[PDB]
Amino acid sequence: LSTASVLAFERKLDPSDALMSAGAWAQRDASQEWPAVTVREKSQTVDVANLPSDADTLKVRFTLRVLGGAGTPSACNDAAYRDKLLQTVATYVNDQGFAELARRYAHNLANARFLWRNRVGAEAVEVRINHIRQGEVARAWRFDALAIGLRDFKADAELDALAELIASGLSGSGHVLLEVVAFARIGDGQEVFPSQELKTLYSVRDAAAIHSQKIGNALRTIDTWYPDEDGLGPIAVEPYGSVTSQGKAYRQPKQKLDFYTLLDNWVLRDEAPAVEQQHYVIANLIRGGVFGE
Amino acid sequence: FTMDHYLDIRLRPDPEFPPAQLMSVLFGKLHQALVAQGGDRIGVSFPDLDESRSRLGERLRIHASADDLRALLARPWLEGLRDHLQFGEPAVVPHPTPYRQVSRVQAKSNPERLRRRLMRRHDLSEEEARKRIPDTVARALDLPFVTLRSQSTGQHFRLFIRHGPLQVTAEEGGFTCYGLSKGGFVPWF
């Protein structure tokens, strides 16, 4: 009949803080003892994180758990709204499962978009994704991140295999944890761009790193179904789909394509189109958030 | 007839848009490209995309005739991006006459460097190095900004580009490029 006063969706596709470490190209195989890059200060005064002078390659590394059961909220206030939401996500996956969203997540893990600023000036990027079964490597991938585009979604055998593995983890048929390690050729003594704190760069234990929410924002840029002119490309799935650095807000609620109007039409009165906005609202609840009255 | 080829590049939107840094990586990769190619025969401009004269355009146009163009940063001779631009392909130019000029300039907004150069040049004293003739009273400045981190052995520059006289007055056949990476008389739209 109505929406609950409190509604909480927990995070799926759980990332970690991407630890960064310098190294040389063609040494990506035995890249375990690689020294982590640290933040220095210079001339009011600012922070800067470069590489060591004998290293032409950055390597970031983070572990991504995927959870599954994304349509089950962690908090509600009425049982009827949770039953209706579970029925809508259940008939979503019974019409078509996680085949488009898992393919786009495998794309955003294939092209190293979690390299936020380090990707745009990189000569060659290689992403290695290891599916850690018990404590060892079960299936290992080796993706050309620059050959796979940022705004076009290709078709490939290995990428559809990664899409099927992320789909199996997202449906709940298996536990999926992926060690994702990206080698980016940037140059000798070039500058890396970790996440900046409240200019102070973020670090954990004498090691510059990217935040977990920045990596979670980067692999979430899959939204291509919105009334923009063609040329923007994929944006991240936020409700009232915003780019606060650009100062614009696509799917503003005067147009009826935001997350909340599509949710309260797709659940409370059974109204959404065939493929596009259902994928948008399901990816938005895959992200998680706080909704309600 | 001056340099009769152009590339109407259009940097697409992207939820990461530091324009100083996008044009920084682009002009830096162009610097790398043309120092690898080698030659003072190339053009670069920025058409009327600066709406105010503060911002700088989201476009570009390179002016090399045939061979330098096709061999330099283009569909061949990798950019390394091929996704954030999805740009096109060049062709012959029309016949305008806005007098065809662009310019580079740099100013002084950090008199520490000048005072240190005085101290180094003939061993100046601290009091005169403090008040011989710094510009501490006023800090000069320039509007159109691009970052362009150092090619090597240095740190973050802040380069400034002033469109020259773009008056619909005349035209002339001059040199190919000044500076290092920036054509001279270039056709403008």
UniProtKB/Swiss-Prot annotation, chain A:
Q: Does the keyword Kinase apply?
A: no
> Which top-level group of life is the source organism from?
Bacteria
Q: What does the record note as the disruption phenotype of the gene behind this chain?
A: Mutants lose phage DMS3 infection-dependent inhibition of biofilm formation while there is normal biofilm formation in the absence of phage infection. Decreased production of crRNA in the presence or absence of phage. Disruption of the entire Y.pestis-subtype CRISPR region disrupts crRNA production but does not alter phage resistance (possibly OLNs PA14_33350 to PA14_33310, and the flanking CRISPR loci), indicating this CRISPR is not involved in phage resistance.
Instruction: List keywords of the entry alphabetically.
Output: Antiviral defense
Instruction: Please give the start and end residues of each transmembrane region.
Output: none
Q: Which InterPro entries match?
A: CRISPR-assoc_prot_Csy3
> Which GO terms of type biological process are on file?
defense response to virus
Asked if the Swiss-Prot or TrEMBL record annotates the protein with the keyword Cell membrane, the reply is no
| Described purpose of this protein according to its UniProt entry | CRISPR (clustered regularly interspaced short palindromic repeat) is an adaptive immune system that provides protection against mobile genetic elements (viruses, transposable elements and conjugative plasmids). CRISPR clusters contain sequences complementary to antecedent mobile elements and target invading nucleic acids. CRISPR clusters are transcribed and processed into CRISPR RNA (crRNA). Cas3 and Cascade participate in CRISPR interference, the third stage of CRISPR immunity (Potential). Involved in crRNA production or stability.
Self-association state and partner proteins as the record states:
Part of the Csy ribonucleoprotein complex with a probable stoichiometry of Csy1(1),Csy2(1),Csy3(6),Cas6/Csy4(1)-crRNA(1). A Csy3(6),Cas6/Csy4(1)-crRNA(1) subcomplex is also formed.
Misc: In this bacteria, Y.pestis-subtype CRISPRs do not confer resistance to phage DMS3 or MP22, but instead are required for DMS3 infection-dependent inhibition of biofilm formation and possibly motility.
Q: Which family does it belong to?
A: Belongs to the CRISPR-associated Csy3 family.
UniProt protein name: CRISPR-associated protein Csy3
UniProtKB/Swiss-Prot annotation, chain B:
Q: Which NCBIfam families match?
A: cas_Csy4
Pfam families per record: Cas_Csy4 (PF09618)
Q: Which CDD domains match?
A: Cas6_I-F
**Biological role stated in the UniProt entry:** CRISPR (clustered regularly interspaced short palindromic repeat) is an adaptive immune system that provides protection against mobile genetic elements (viruses, transposable elements and conjugative plasmids). CRISPR clusters contain sequences complementary to antecedent mobile elements and target invading nucleic acids. CRISPR clusters are transcribed and processed into CRISPR RNA (crRNA). Processes pre-crRNA into individual crRNA units. Absolutely required for crRNA production or stability.
Q: How the protein is affected by changing H31D? A: Cleaves pre-crRNA 910-fold slower
Single GO term (MF): endonuclease activity
From the UniProt record, report the name of the gene that encodes this protein.
Answer: cas6f
* Organism, as annotated: Pseudomonas aeruginosa (strain UCBPP-PA14)
Q: How is the cofactor bound?
A: Metal-ion independent.
What are its GO biological-process terms?
A: defense response to virus; maintenance of CRISPR repeat elements
Q: What happens when the gene is disrupted?
A: Infection with phage DMS3 inhibits biofilm formation; disrupting this gene restores biofilm formation despite DMS3 infection. Normal biofilm formation in the absence of phage infection. Loss of production of crRNA in the presence or absence of phage. Disruption of the entire Y.pestis-subtype CRISPR region disrupts crRNA production but does not alter phage resistance (possibly OLNs PA14_33350 to PA14_33310, plus the flanking CRISPR loci), indicating this CRISPR is not involved in phage resistance.
Effect annotated for changing H31A: No pre-crRNA cleavage, still binds crRNA. Does not support formation of the Csy ribonucleoprotein complex
Active site, renumbered: H31
- Protein's UniProt name: CRISPR-associated endonuclease Cas6/Csy4
